[PDB]
Design a protein around this ligand. Structure first.
Ligand SMILES: Nc1ncnc2c1ncn2[C@@H]1O[C@H](COP(=O)(O)OP(=O)(O)O)[C@@H](O)[C@H]1O
Ligand SMILES: Nc1ncnc2c1ncn2[C@@H]1O[C@H](COP(=O)(O)OP(=O)(O)O)[C@@H](O)[C@H]1O
Ligand SMILES: Nc1ncnc2c1ncn2[C@@H]1O[C@H](COP(=O)(O)OP(=O)(O)O)[C@@H](O)[C@H]1O
Ligand code: BEF
Ligand code: BEF
Ligand code: BEF
Ligand SMILES: [Mg+2]
Ligand SMILES: [Mg+2]
Ligand SMILES: [Mg+2]
Ligand SMILES: [Zn+2]
Ligand SMILES: [Zn+2]
Ligand SMILES: [Zn+2]
Ligand SMILES: [Zn+2]
Lengths: 362, 334, 369, 367, 360
DNA sequence: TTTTTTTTATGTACTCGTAGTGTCTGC
DNA sequence: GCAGACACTACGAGTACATA
C-alpha cells in the first residue's frame, strides 16, 4: 500500500526526537523557557542535518496552546495543525522559489496584521540564501524594527552568501554534522520502530557512507530495503555501495602502494564500469599523493576538507616512507603527461599504474 | 604608416591580379612586423573599394577616396583589438560578420581587413571560417600575420597565402642609413635583430628601444664576469619584456655560434661583450641558458595576464643556479 | 541671434506640433537628437523634427509681424506647454540670450535652446515616382498586413514590409517566415514596376500620418528615401535594401480543399479555443468534416478545449495543426462577413481569404506533423 | 515495414528486455513489488546504458492499468501512449531546453493538480545536470515533501554537477557500463530479428568498438549495415573501424621483437597496400604491447575477443622482459607523439619502427 | 566566385567526389535502401570535404524523384540548394551561432512542417564550437527527432564534441586524400579549365597540400596568380620555397661532422638565397630517414637517390643508427618548436645547435 | 597601526528599471 | 476617444557564476 518514505514519516516532532546537536536544542530550550528570545534565528548546517526540522519544531514550540515552552504538548489544535502543512500563523515561505522582491513584498506586508490564532506570527523562510538583493533589503527593513508579535526563522545551507548586515541582526545557530555513532544509533531506532530486519555491519556501512547526514542515511536505507528484498543484509548494502562507490582514488592508491596487481586491475575495471574521465581520476590521484607527501611533513597539513577519509589517509601517510611517495608522484605525473597520446585513456592509465607498481615491491 | 620602395613590385603584381577579377577574395599576408603589412593592405583596400578610373593608382577626387582619407567609410571594416584589450574578441568578429550580409551602402565592393590574424582567439577564427569560405560576392578579405602556422589550420587553408620577401641586407642598410644616422655596425645589428625587416630596425632607433638595449648590454658586461645574473631584473622587466628577452637570446646565440667559430655574428655592434660571454660560460651552460630564455619568452607571449615580474625573477635565479658548478642542466624535451 | 517675435494661434499649432512630435520619443541616443526646429520665412512657420532616419515638416501661416529665423526647442516640453492653455490664446515666442521666452496672457516660460545649425537634415533624392491615393485606401491597405511583419529578427529585413508597383496596381506584402500577408489593389494611374521595403517604424509613422477623407495623400517613392504629402504635412523616411521572398511562390497554387465560414463565428471560436492552448506553443488542431470544423487545444496542464463550428465543406478529414495567434490576428484584420479557408495537404500551408473579395490574402504554415 | 533506426526501434519496452544493469532492474522491480515507492529517482551512468529507457519503463510500471505492478503487463491502454510517447501524464522535460528558473517555477506551480488519467504524474527530467542553480534551489522543497500523486525521475550523465542537497533527498541508482559480452549478445539478437546475415568476428568487433554503451553500438552496427550491402561482414567492419583485426599488428610486434627489419618493412608495405591509416597501425601496436604487459603482470587477463591469438600472446608473455615491454611502449609512444610532425606519416612510422629496432636491448643494429 | 577555385568547383554529384569510397558507398547504400538515419556526422581534417558531402547528401534526400542515391542534377529543389535559395534546409555555422539562445530557437522551429521537400535538413557546420549548454539542448532532439527532420553535423575534430553527441550519430571519418588522388583531381580541374600545367609542378602542389584538397586548390590559385597566369614548375618551386639542390645533404653532412663554421655558413647562404626554413628541415628529416632505411638494406637507397648515392652510402657507413635516431629526434623537436620562435631562421639555428652537441 | 588586492575569453542566468504596445474602461 | 491606466512584454544593466 502507501509506504511513506523514511525521509518524511520519521521527521522529528519534539526536541527529544532530534539526534545530537545538543548545543542548539539546549540553547533554544533555555531561551524559550526563560524570557530571552531573539527577534530572528538563523539556522545553518550541511546537507540535511536538521535545519528545517528544528525550525519547524521551534515554530511548533513558540505557538503551542500551553504557552511558550521547550516541549510542545503535541495535543492541542495548534500542535496538530502545524504538524500538517495547513496553518495560518506559521508561514512557510519557499524562499528558493519566491526569490523576486515582488513575491517577497506580498508576504512581508503581512507583518502589519495581527496573528490570527497564536501569540506570534512566525515566518519560516527556508533556503534564505537565495533571495535577490532588493528582497534582502526589504527583509532587512522589516527586521530593523520588527513588531513584538513576529519571530523570524531562517534556514539555509550556506550562511556566508547572506549579506553581512542581515546576518548581524540574527542569532545564528550552526548545526554540527552528525557523527557516525549517532547516525548508526538513530538508524537502528528507525529500523526497529518498523519491521525491517538488519545486521549491525550493514548499519555501520550505511553510517560511514552517509557522510554525516540523516537524510543521506535514510535515503540509502530505503534504497537498501528496496534492493534487499525487505531485509537489510550486509552483502546487499556492500554490493550497492560498490555500485555507488566514488572514492576509487584512495582505494586504488592503497592497492598501488601495497602493490596488489589484481586489486589494481579490479579497481580499474570497476572505474571503467562507471563512466569516469581518466584525466580527472589521474589528476586527483596526483592530488592525493600530494596531500600524503604534505602530511609527511606536518600532521596539520590534512585540513578539514578530507575528514571523511582522515584515518585511512593518515595511515597511508604514516606507514610509507616519503621517498616512495615522491617516486610514485613522479611516475604518475609523467604517465599523465603522456596519457592523451596512449592507445586509450583507460589503456594509458592502466600502464601508468603498472609502471608505478613494478617499482619497490616485486 | 609609410610607403616603402620594396613594396612596389608586390603591390603591382597583386593589384594586377585584382583588376582582372582573378585575385582570391581571402588574402593572407606573411609580412614581418614593421614591413609593408598595413601599407599594402590599405593601398589594396583603397583601390578596391572606390572607383578605378586611373587604373592602379588612387583617384583621390572620388567620394570613396575621401572617405578612406577621413577614415569613416561604412564598407571598410577593420578588426582590431580595443585599447583596453590585447587579443581580438569573437564579439567583434560576429558583429562584423552579421554586418557583412548587409548590401554595400555605396553600392560598391566590400572589404574586411583584420589588423593581425594571429591575435584572433580560437572562437574568433572559427566564426570567420564560414564567411571566409563562402563570402558575399562584393566582399574581399585581408589577413596579416608573421607566422601562418600559428593560425588555426582550417583558417590558414581557406585563405590564399602571399609572402613578402625581406630586402637584401645591403639594400636594407642603404635604405635605413638614409633617414637614420647611426653606425654601420649598429645599423646592421638592428637590421639582423629584426630578421632583416626594415621599419622594425628603424623602430629600434626611432623609439626608446635602443637605449634600453644599450643599458642591457652594460648590465650584461657588469654581470657575466661576476656570475651575479641578478640586477638584470631591472633591465628586463618592462612592457617590452619579450623584445629584450629576444635581445638576450640573440646575444646568447651569438656567443654559442662564435664558440664554434662561425663566420657571421648576429650581434656585431658589441664584439667584446659576446667575446666575454664566450669566455666565462661553458657551451653546455650557454645552450641551457639560451633554451630557458627562449622558453620563458614563449611563456610570456602565449599565456595572458601572467605576472612578468615573477617569471623574469625566476629565470634569473635559475640562471644563477645554472652558473654554479656541479649543477645538472635541463634537457630539451617533447 | 535675432528676436523671433513669432505669434502663433493655438488652434493652428497644437495638431501640427503633435504630428511632428510623433516619430520622436523615448530617450534619444545623443542630445539635440530629441528636439524640434521651428523656422519662419515670409509669414510661414515650419515645424520640423527628425530621428536622422525620419523627418516631419508642418507648415502653418502667420499674419502677425515676425522675422525670418530658425530656432530649436526640446520637443516634449514645448508640446506640453502649448497644450493646456486657454482656448484661442495666442502664443508669442521670442529669442533672447540663447533662450526662448514663450508668452500667453500673463504666463511666461523660458526654455533652453540650441543653434539651428545643430539640427541635422536628411538625404536628398530627385525623380521620385509620384502617387495620388486616398487616405483610407492606403490605411486599410497597410492595416491588412501591419501585424504581418516580424519585429526584431535577423533574417532578411523583415523589420518592414514590401511595396510592389506593377501596371496600374499597388500590392503590399509582409511576412515572418511562418505567416505571410498580401493585399493588392488597383490605384488608377500609369505606373512602372518597383519593389521597395519600408521599415516598420516608417510603417507606424505612415499610419499616424493618415487623417481625414479629404485631399488625397501623395507618395514620392525612390530607392533610399520615401516621402508622403498630406495637405501641409510632409513626412520623409529612409528605406531598407534587400528583398523579400517571392510571395507568389509562398501562396499555395492548389487550393483544392475549400471551406466557407462566418467571420465573427470563427473568430469567437478561435478566441475561446486560445484560452486553453499552450501559452508558448499556441497551436490548435483542426478536424474538417462535411459542413463541420472541429478545433482542439491542449496545454501542459492538460485542460483540453474542444469546439465545433458549422461551415461549408465537402471532402476528407485533414487534421491541420497550426498556431492560434496568427489566425486570430488575421480574422481580426478581415472584419468581413464570410471567410474562405483553403487547404491543400496535411503538411502543406493554409490560405485565408475574404470570401467576397480577392484584394487581401494570407497564408499560414502548419505547426506539427 | 519501413526502416527506422535501431536505436529507436529496439528501445526496451519491458524490464525483461533490458540487458545488464542487474542491480538497478532488481531493485526497481523489488521495490515496486513491495509497494515502497520513493518520490525521487536519479539514474546516473555513462551515455547510452539505458537510464532514459529504464526511467520510461518505471513510468510504465507506475502508471499501468492493473495497478502498481513490477512487470508491465504487456501493452495496456495507459502504456500505449507511453510507447508512442504521447502520454497525458508522463511529462517529459528536456531540462537542457528549460534551464531557466522562470520555467521550473511554472513546473512547480501546477504540481498539485491531480493527474488526468494515470496514478502519478511522473515528471521525467532528462539531463537534470543542466538546470540552472536557481532552478535547482527552486525544486529542493518540492522534492523534499512532494504531493502524494507526483513522482520525479531524474536522469543525468554526471551527478557531481548537481548540488549535494539534491543528491541527498533522491534515490541514487548508478548504471554501470555494459560488458562486451552483453553488447555482443544483444547485437546478435537484434541482427537475428532483422533477418540479416552476420559474422561472429564482425559482431565481436562491434562489441569492442563501442565503449560499454548500447546505442553507440547500435549506431555503429547501423553504419556497418550501410557500409555493407545490408550485411554485417568482417571485411566491412574492419573497413569502417580502421582496425587491424588481431593478426597483422601481432605479426608486426613479433617481427619487431625478433629484430628482423626486413619482414617489418615488408608488412609495412602490405599495410600501405591495405590502404589503412598509419596512426591506426601505431595505436594498434601500442595496444598489443600493453596487452602483453597485462598478461605478463596478471596471468589471466585476456578476454575472449583475443582468443584467436591468445596462444601467441602467451609466447611473448614467456619470452620478453617487462623492462623491454616498457621500453618498446615508451619508444612507440614517443613515436606517436612525433608522428604528426614527421615529413610523411608513413615515413614517420618507418622511423619509429627503426628507432625501436636500433635501441633493441637484445639484438640492436650493428654499428 | 569569378575564378576562385574550391568554391566554383564544389562537387555536385556522388560520382564527382574524389576518393571517399567507403563514405560514398555507405551513403549510397543507405539512400538506395530504407536505411536512413536522423544524425550523420562527417568528421575529418581540413579540406577533405566535410561540407560538400553534407550538401550532396541533402540534395540527394530532397530531390523530386524521392530518396535517390545519386542526386538528379537539373531540377528546382536541387538548384535551389546549390544556389542557396533553400527553404527545407537550414545551414548554420555553429561557430557564429554559439549562443544557446539561438540553439533553443532552432529547437523551437523543429516541429514546423517543411514548405517543400520531404525532409527538413539541418546542416550544422563547425559543430565543435557550440557551447556546452547548446550541445545539451541538441542532445534530446538528436536522440528522437520528428520523422520529417534530419540533422547533418560536420566538424574538424570530434574530440571537442560531448561524447553523448557522438553516441547519437553515425560517424563517417573522411580519410585524408593521398598524393595520387589529389594530383589526379588537380590535373582534371586544370584540363577542364584549359590552364597550362606541368606534371612535376603538379606533384609539388600535391605534396605540399598535406592531404587536404582545398589547400591544393588554393596553392594552384596562388601559382596561377603568380607566374605568368599558368602552372609551371619554376613558378611553383619558387613560390613554395622548396629546395631542389644538395644544400640539404651538405647541411646534413656538416652537422654530422659538427663543422660549426661550415654548418652555419650553409644556413647563412640559405638565408641569402631565401630558402624557406620549414621545408629545409623537412628535407633534413627525409635525408635522415633515408639514412636509417639504408642501414637495414642498401636497396632502401631511395631509387638511386638522384646522383648523390655515394654520399649517403658513405654516411650510412660512418654513423651508428643511435646517433641517426638522436639527430632525427632533435630535428623533429626543432620543427615542432619552430613556429614558437622569434623568427624561423633563429629557430632553425637553435635546432642545429641542439643537434650538433651530441659529439658529432 | 597601515596600506595594502587579481588573468581572460566566452557564455549563461537572474533580477530590477524603464520604454513601447494593447486595450479597456469610465472617461 | 482618449488619454490614461494600467498591464504586460521586452531590453539593458548590474551582478554571479561556469568553463577552459
Ligand atoms: N536531528 C534529527 N533527528 C531526526 N531525524 C533527522 C534529524 N536531522 C535530520 N533528520 C532526518 O532527515 C530528514 C530531513 O531532515 P531536515 O530536518 O529537512 O534537514 P534540513 O536541515 O537539511 O532541512 C528528516 O525527515 C529526518 O528523517
Ligand atoms: N540496458 C539496455 N538494454 C537494452 N537496450 C539499451 C540499454 N541501454 C541502452 N540501450 C539502447 O539504447 C537506446 C537508447 O538508450 P537510452 O536509454 O536513451 O540511453 P540513455 O541512458 O543515454 O538515455 C535504446 O533504444 C536501446 O536500444
Ligand atoms: N572529396 C572532394 N572532392 C572534390 N572536391 C573537394 C573534395 N574535398 C574538398 N574539395 C574541395 O574543397 C572545397 C571545400 O570542401 P569542403 O567539403 O567544405 O571541406 P570540409 O570538409 O573541410 O568542409 C570544395 O569546394 C571542393 O573544391
Ligand atoms: F533541507 Be536541508 F537544508 F538539506
Ligand atoms: F541519455 Be543518453 F546519454 F543518450
Ligand atoms: F574546412 Be572543413 F569543414 F574541415
Ligand atoms: Mg531543509
Ligand atoms: Mg536520454
Ligand atoms: Mg566546413
Ligand atoms: Zn500544543
Ligand atoms: Zn577613389
Ligand atoms: Zn501496461
Ligand atoms: Zn534534384
Amino acid at each position: 500500500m502507501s509506504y511513506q518514505v523514511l525521509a518524511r514519516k520519521w521527521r522529528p516532532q519534539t526536541f527529544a526526537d532530534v539526534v545530537g546537536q545538543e548545543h542548539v536544542l539546549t540553547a533554544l530550550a533555555n531561551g524559550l523557557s526563560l524570557g530571552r528570545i531573539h527577534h530572528a534565528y538563523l539556522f545553518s548546517g550541511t546537507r540535511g542535518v536538521g535545519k528545517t526540522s528544528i525550525a519547524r519544531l521551534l515554530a511548533k514550540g513558540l505557538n503551542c496552546e500551553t504557552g511558550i515552552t521547550a516541549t510542545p504538548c503535541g495535543v492541542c489544535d495548534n500542535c496538530r495543525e502545524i504538524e500538517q502543512g495547513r496553518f495560518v500563523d506559521l508561514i512557510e515561505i519557499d524562499a528558493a522559489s519566491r526569490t523576486k522582491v515582488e513575491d517577497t513584498r506580498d508576504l512581508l506586508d503581512n507583518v502589519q496584521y495581527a496573528p490570527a490564532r497564536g501569540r506570534f506570527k512566525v515566518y519560516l523562510i527556508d533556503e534564505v540564501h537565495m533571495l535577490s538583493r532588493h528582497s534582502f533589503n526589504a527583509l532587512l527593513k522589516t527586521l530593523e524594527e520588527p513588531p513584538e508579535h513576529v519571530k523570524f526563522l531562517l534556514a539555509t545551507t550556506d550562511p556566508q552568501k547572506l549579506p553581512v548586515t542581515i546576518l548581524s541582526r540574527c542569532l545564528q545557530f550552526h548545526l554540527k554534522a552528525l557523527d557516525v555513532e549517532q547516525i548508526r544509533h538513530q538508524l537502528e531506532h528507525i529500523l526497529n520502530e518498523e519491521h525491517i530486519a538488519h545486521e549491525p555491519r550493514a548499519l555501520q556501512l550505511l553510517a560511514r557512507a552517509a557522510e554525516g547526514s540523516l537524510r543521506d542515511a535514510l535515503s540509502l536505507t530505503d534504497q537498501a530495503i528496496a534492493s534487499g528484498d525487505g531485509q537489510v543484509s550486509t552483502q546487499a548494502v556492500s554490493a550497492m555501495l560498490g555500485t555507488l562507490d566514488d572514492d576509487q582514488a584512495l582505494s586504488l592508491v592503497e592497492a598501488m602502494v601495497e602493490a596488489n596487481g589484481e586489486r589494481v586491475m579490479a579497481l580499474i575495471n570497476e572505474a571503467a564500469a562507471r563512466g569516469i574521465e581518466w584525466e580527472a581520476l589521474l589528476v586527483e590521484m596526483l592530488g592525493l599523493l600530494h596531500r600524503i607527501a604534505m602530511v609527511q611533513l606536518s600532521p596539520a597539513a590534512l585540513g578539514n576538507d578530507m575528514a571523511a577519509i582522515e584515518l585511512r589517509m593518515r595511515e597511508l601517510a604514516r606507514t610509507i616512507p616519503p621517498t616512495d611517495i615522491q617516486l610514485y608522484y613522479q611516475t604518475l605525473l609523467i604517465g599523465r603527461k603522456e596519457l592523451p597520446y596512449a592507445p586509450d585513456r583507460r589503456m594509458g592509465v592502466e600502464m601508468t599504474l603498472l609502471r608505478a607498481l613494478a617499482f619497490h615491491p616485486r | 604608416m609609410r610607403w616603402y620602395p620594396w613594396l612596389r613590385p608586390d603591390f603591382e603584381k597583386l593589384v594586377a591580379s585584382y583588376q582582372a577579377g582573378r585575385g582570391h577574395h581571402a588574402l593572407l599576408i606573411q609580412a614581418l612586423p614593421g614591413m609593408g603589412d598595413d601599407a599594402l593592405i590599405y593601398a589594396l583596400s583603397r583601390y578596391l573599394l572606390c572607383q578605378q578610373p586611373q587604373g592602379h593608382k588612387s583617384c583621390g577626387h572620388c567620394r570613396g577616396c575621401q572617405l578612406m582619407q577621413a577614415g569613416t567609410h561604412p564598407d571598410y571594416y577593420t578588426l582590431a583589438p580595443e585599447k583596453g584589450k590585447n587579443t581580438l574578441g569573437v564579439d567583434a568578429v560576429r558583429e562584423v560578420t552579421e554586418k557583412l550580409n548587409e548590401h554595400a551602402r555605396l553600392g560598391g565592393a566590400k572589404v574586411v581587413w583584420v589588423t593581425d590574424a594571429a591575435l584572433l582567439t580560437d572562437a574568433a577564427a572559427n566564426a570567420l571560417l564560414k564567411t571566409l569560405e563562402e563570402p558575399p560576392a562584393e566582399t574581399w578579405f585581408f589577413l596579416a600575420t608573421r607566422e601562418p602556422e600559428r593560425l588555426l589550420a582550417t583558417l590558414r587553408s581557406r585563405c590564399r597565402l602571399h609572402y613578402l620577401a625581406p630586402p637584401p641586407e645591403q639594400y636594407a642598410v642603404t635604405w635605413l642609413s638614409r633617414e637614420v644616422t647611426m653606425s654601420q655596425d649598429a645599423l646592421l645589428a638592428a637590421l639582423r635583430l629584426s630578421a632583416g625587416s626594415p621599419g622594425a630596425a628603424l623602430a629600434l632607433f626611432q623609439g626608446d628601444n635602443w637605449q634600453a638595449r644599450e643599458t642591457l648590454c652594460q648590465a650584461l658586461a657588469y654581470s657575466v664576469p661576476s656570475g651575479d645574473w641578478y640586477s638584470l631584473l631591472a633591465a628586463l622587466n618592462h612592457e617590452q619584456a619579450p623584445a629584450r628577452l629576444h635581445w638576450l637570446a640573440t646575444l646568447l646565440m651569438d656567443a654559442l655560434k662564435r664558440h664554434h667559430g662561425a663566420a657571421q655574428v648576429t650581434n656585431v655592434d658589441v664584439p667584446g661583450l659576446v667575446a666575454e660571454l664566450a669566455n666565462h660560460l661553458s657551451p653546455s651552460r650557454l645552450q641551457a641558458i639560451l633554451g630557458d630564455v627562449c622558453h620563458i619568452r614563449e611563456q610570456l607571449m602565449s599565456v595572458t595576464g601572467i605576472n612578468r615580474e615573477l617569471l623574469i625573477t625566476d629565470l634569473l635565479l635559475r640562471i644563477e643556479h645554472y652558473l654554479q658548478p656541479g649543477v645538472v642542466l635541463p634537457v630539451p624535451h617533447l | 541671434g535675432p528676436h523671433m517675435k513669432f505669434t502663433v494661434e493655438r488652434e493652428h499649432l497644437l495638431k501640427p506640433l503633435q504630428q511632428v512630435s510623433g516619430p520622436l520619443g523615448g530617450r534619444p541616443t545623443l542630445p539635440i537628437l530629441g528636439n524640434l526646429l521651428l523656422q519662419v520665412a515670409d509669414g510661414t512657420l515650419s515645424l520640423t523634427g527628425t530621428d536622422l532616419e525620419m523627418e516631419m515638416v508642418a507648415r502653418v501661416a502667420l499674419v502677425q509681424p515676425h522675422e525670418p529665423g530658425a530656432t530649436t526647442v526640446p520637443a516634449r516640453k514645448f508640446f506640453d506647454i502649448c497644450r493646456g492653455l486657454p482656448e484661442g490664446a495666442e502664443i508669442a515666442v521670442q529669442l533672447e540670450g540663447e533662450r526662448m521666452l514663450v508668452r500667453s496672457g500673463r504666463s511666461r516660460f523660458s526654455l533652453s535652446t540650441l543653434p539651428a545649425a545643430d539640427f541635422p537634415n536628411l538625404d536628398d533624392w530627385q525623380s521620385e515616382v509620384e502617387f495620388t491615393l486616398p487616405q483610407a485606401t492606403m490605411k486599410r491597405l497597410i492595416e491588412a498586413t501591419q501585424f504581418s511583419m516580424a519585429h526584431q529578427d535577423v533574417r532578411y529585413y523583415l523589420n518592414g514590409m514590401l511595396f510592389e508597383t506593377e501596371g496600374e496596381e499597388l500590392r503590399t506584402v509582409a511576412t515572418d517566415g511562418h505567416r505571410l500577408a498580401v493585399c493588392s489593389m488597383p490605384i488608377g494611374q500609369s505606373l512602372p514596376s518597383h519593389s521597395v521595403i519600408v521599415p516598420r517604424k516608417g510603417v507606424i509613422e505612415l499610419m499616424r500620418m493618415l487623417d481625414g477623407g479629404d485631399n488625397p495623400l501623395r507618395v514620392q517613392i525612390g530607392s533610399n528615401n520615401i516621402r508622403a504629402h498630406v495637405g501641409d504635412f510632409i513626412f520623409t523616411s529612409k528605406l531598407v535594401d534587400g528583398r523579400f521572398p517571392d510571395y507568389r511562390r509562398v501562396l499555395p497554387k492548389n487550393p483544392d480543399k475549400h471551406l466557407e465560414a462566418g467571420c465573427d463565428l470563427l473568430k469567437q471560436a478561435f478566441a475561446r479555443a486560445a484560452i486553453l492552448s499552450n501559452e508558448k506553443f499556441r497551436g490548435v488542431r483542426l478536424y474538417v468534416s462535411e459542413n463541420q470544423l472541429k478545433i482542439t487545444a491542449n496545454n501542459p496542464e492538460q485542460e483540453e478545449a474542444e469546439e465545433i463550428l458549422d461551415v461549408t465543406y465537402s471532402g476528407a478529414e485533414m487534421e491541420i495543426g497550426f498556431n492560434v495567434s496568427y489566425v486570430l490576428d488575421v480574422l481580426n484584420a478581415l472584419k468581413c462577413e464570410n471567410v474562405r479557408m483553403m487547404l491543400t495537404d496535411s503538411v502543406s500551408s493554409v490560405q485565408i481569404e475574404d470570401a467576397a473579395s480577392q484584394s487581401a490574402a494570407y497564408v499560414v504554415m502548419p505547426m506539427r506533423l
